[PDB]
């Protein structure tokens, strides 16, 4: 059993998003399928569920009027549709299928969510695709240095150091969302003060949506 979801989406406030969930394995039409969301740094929130055979749907009171969940038996696909989007709808959306009891996946239904999609990040914003600027955080026997990765949209950004060769002492922070609508993050690493002369430090930044790829040397002075 495998729940594959559609990919990340940026959406204007007031608009609508449709997220799909393709299930492969077992019997699609007989088992309950639910949508659960998670705002950044928040808990899991149940939105609704269906049973494709019976077309029997239930919606969390919070979302009823704004949400439609459907299951397409011919393609074995579930769809979440959420309307009149606001910033607080920015979240990871999950499809989850109820489990079964025994060996194989045609067993008796247990209600609880045994199977989960990988998630779909839906970002609700007016901002447009922008690459970050990358600024060094220069070192002053333990020293600290880093990169400030500023003003990009949307998520995500990955950061490494010396192409993966430097990992000890590395702290790459979750992004903060600025008043501009743009994200910012920084990555730091502590190292021995004596090696600022011997060793070279380079933060590799990757922001795929804007094709920004910077390999930035960070040095003292």
């Amino acid at each position: 059993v495998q729940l594959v979801q559609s990919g990340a989406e940026v959406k204007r406030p007031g608009s609508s998003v449709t997220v799909s969930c393709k299930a492969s394995g077992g019997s699609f039409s007989t088992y309950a399928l639910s949508w659960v969301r998670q705002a950044p740094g928040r808990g899991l929130e149940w939105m609704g569920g269906v049973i494709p055979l019976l077309t029997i749907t239930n919606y969390a009171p919070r979302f009823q009027g704004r949400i439609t969940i459907t299951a397409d038996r011919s393609t074995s696909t579930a769809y979440l549709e959420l309307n009149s989007l606001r910033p607080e709808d920015t979240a990871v959306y999950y499809c989850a299928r109820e489990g079964t009891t025994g060996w194989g996946w045609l067993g008796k239904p247990i209600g609880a969510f045994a199977h989960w999609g990988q998630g779909t990040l839906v970002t609700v914003s007016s901002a447009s695709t922008k690459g970050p600027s990358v600024f060094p955080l220069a070192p002053s026997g333990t020293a600290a240095l880093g990169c400030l990765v500023k003003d990009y949209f949307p998520e995500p950004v990955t950061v490494s150091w010396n192409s993966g060769a430097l990992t000890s002492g590395v702290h790459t922070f979750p992004a903060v969302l600025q008043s501009s609508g743009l994200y910012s993050l920084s990555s730091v690493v502590t190292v021995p003060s004596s090696s600022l002369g011997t060793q070279t430090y380079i933060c590799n930044v990757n922001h795929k949506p804007s094709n920004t790829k910077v390999d930035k040397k960070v040095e003292p002075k």
Binding site: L44, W46, A60, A112, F113, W116, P174, A175, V188
Partner: protein, 212 residues
């Protein structure tokens, strides 16, 4: 609608120790359709217990669930490293399912005070007309910490943001970075930039500063 309360919201425990997490329901949970899920950072939830006490195969047997009515418990008999995570309860006995806010199980360790560093804006940023000053709080525990910015000893407000890492898997500490942002013109009106730090591991608050 049924409210599920997981309290406390955070538990600091040591590797190998025993853990019991509470989930109290505002109303009786029909047919004890109560489940427990685990979730780690950057991953989808995993089903652990269902029907209050039933454990799927494949789920480690140090996890058990108990209770009925409005009072439920998950027990982790021994905390292995991969078990420091967030655990969620959920009822699905109605046609409307709800989730508890979750309990985070983190690694307890000795009080460690932050190493504090400050970084002025780089020349490259200044040319662009903005100035960001970063305060790094590195490798502390417990998680709770506090940074305040002071520009010529004026308490700053509304122009800084911060983020915290997940708990390090090696040394069980946390780090925090705060960023103070001013337009270049504003940055050049002031002399002393300071970040002031408060934390259990420091008996009095620490200041790192520079002179523009």
């Amino acid at each position: 609608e049924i409210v599920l309360t997981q309290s406390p919201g955070t538990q600091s425990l040591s590797p190998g120790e025993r853990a019991t997490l509470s989930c109290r329901a505002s109303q009786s949970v029909g047919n004890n359709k109560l489940a427990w899920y685990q979730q780690r950072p950057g991953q989808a939830p995993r089903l652990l217990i269902y029907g209050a006490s039933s454990r799927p195969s494949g789920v480690a047997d140090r996890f058990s669930g108990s209770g009925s009515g409005t009072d439920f418990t998950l027990t982790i008999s021994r905390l292995e490293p991969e078990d420091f995570a967030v655990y969620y309860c959920q009822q699905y006995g109605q046609s409307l399912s709800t989730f508890g806010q979750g309990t985070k199980v983190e690694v307890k360790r000795t009080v460690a005070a932050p190493s504090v560093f400050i970084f002025p804006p780089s020349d490259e940023q200044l040319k662009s007309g903005t100035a960001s000053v970063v305060c790094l709080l590195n490798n502390f525990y417990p998680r709770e910490a506090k940074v305040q910015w002071k520009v010529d000893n004026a308490l700053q407000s509304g122009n800084s943001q911060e983020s915290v890492t997940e708990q390090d898997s090696k040394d069980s500490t946390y780090s925090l970075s705060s960023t103070l942002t001013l337009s270049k013109a504003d940055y050049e009106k002031h002399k002393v930039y300071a970040c002031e730090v408060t934390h259990q591991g420091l008996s009095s608050p620490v200041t790192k500063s520079f002179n523009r």
